[PDB]
Design an enzyme around this catalytic site. Structure first.
Site, short mmCIF file in Angstrom:
data_model
loop_
_atom_site.label_atom_id
_atom_site.label_comp_id
_atom_site.label_asym_id
_atom_site.label_seq_id
_atom_site.Cartn_x
_atom_site.Cartn_y
_atom_site.Cartn_z
N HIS A 9 0.81 -1.21 0.00
CA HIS A 9 0.00 0.00 0.00
C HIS A 9 0.84 1.26 0.00
CE1 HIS A 9 0.71 1.07 4.15
NE2 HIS A 9 0.53 -0.20 4.49
N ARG A 60 -6.08 0.74 4.56
CA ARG A 60 -5.02 1.29 3.73
C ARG A 60 -4.61 0.34 2.61
NH1 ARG A 60 -2.79 0.10 8.91
NH2 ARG A 60 -0.69 -0.85 8.87
N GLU A 87 -0.42 -6.12 8.41
CA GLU A 87 0.90 -5.68 8.85
C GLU A 87 1.27 -6.40 10.14
OE1 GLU A 87 3.36 -2.85 7.52
OE2 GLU A 87 3.92 -4.77 8.43
N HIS A 182 0.92 -5.34 2.96
CA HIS A 182 1.68 -4.46 3.81
C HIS A 182 3.16 -4.86 3.78
CE1 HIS A 182 -2.05 -2.98 5.84
NE2 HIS A 182 -2.48 -4.18 5.52
#
Length: 236
Positions: A9, A60, A87, A182
């Site tokens: 992202h 995100r 993440e 991520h």
């Protein structure tokens, strides 16, 4: 030969503010939006398409996918959202300014928090507001599998079952897979795919918003990988 495309992202609000993020569900900035849109336009221009995408439960990453889908005219494809692509969980560091954290604890300490393959940051307290137990994203995850902090080793262990159980079968079934996720969850897949050592993997940085293409053979072993777009710009 199969192709798998990965994309990290673009810039989040907390990237902008230099705050450790982890599982905190912050959104993209205008800049992150445009980076997503540009990755999409790159893929489209190169003639890539996808039959399915994988992403995290974090907006995100999901918004980044949405921009890619929108630019590619692939808004109708099946999307698998999995907490497994989240993440790395940053524990009680989540939300702290990184510069300030270094100031307070020293570079050494923070190095270990950031880079130690097997030693995680300090954990959230169980009753912390940032803890995941009440979050509808994780309602169906057994409570003991939910992190209050993670090192990359944990993140790897949590990512790989999604690969084995769902992504790998997709790829073998002839589906053209995009994974929008991520930095650390991608690092984990790459570690696995390229047989990277515990030692070397913490060095790999992945640029935001740049499609990372893996060519895989019949055994799902990489033949090679490359970023799409401006190599010189990427290299910088």
């Amino acid at each position: 030969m199969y192709k798998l495309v990965l994309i990290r992202h673009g810039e989040s609000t907390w990237n902008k503010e230099n705050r450790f993020t982890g599982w905190v569900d912050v959104d993209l900035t205008e800049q992150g939006n445009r980076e997503a849109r540009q990755a999409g336009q790159l893929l489209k221009e190169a003639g890539y398409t996808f039959d399915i995408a994988y992403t995290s439960v974090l907006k995100r990453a999901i918004r980044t996918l949405w921009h890619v889908q929108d630019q590619m005219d692939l808004m109708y494809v099946p999307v698998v959202h999995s907490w497994r692509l989240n993440e790395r969980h940053y524990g009680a560091l989540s939300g702290l300014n990184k510069a300030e954290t270094a100031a307070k604890y020293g570079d050494e300490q923070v190095l270990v928090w950031r880079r130690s393959y097997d030693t995680p940051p300090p954990a959230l307290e169980p009753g912390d507001e940032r803890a995941p137990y009440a979050d509808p994203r994780y309602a169906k995850v057994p409570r003991e599998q939910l992190p209050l902090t993670e090192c990359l080793k944990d993140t790897v262990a949590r990512v790989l079952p999604l690969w084995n159980e769902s992504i790998a079968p997709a790829v073998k079934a002839g589906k053209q897979v995009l994974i929008a996720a991520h930095g650390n969850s991608l690092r984990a897949l790459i570690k696995y795919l390229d047989g990277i050592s515990d030692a070397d993997i913490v060095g790999l940085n992945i640029p935001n918003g740049v499609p990372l293409v893996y060519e895989l053979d019949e055994s799902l072993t990489p033949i090679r990988h490359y970023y799409l777009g401006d190599q010189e710009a990427i290299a910088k």
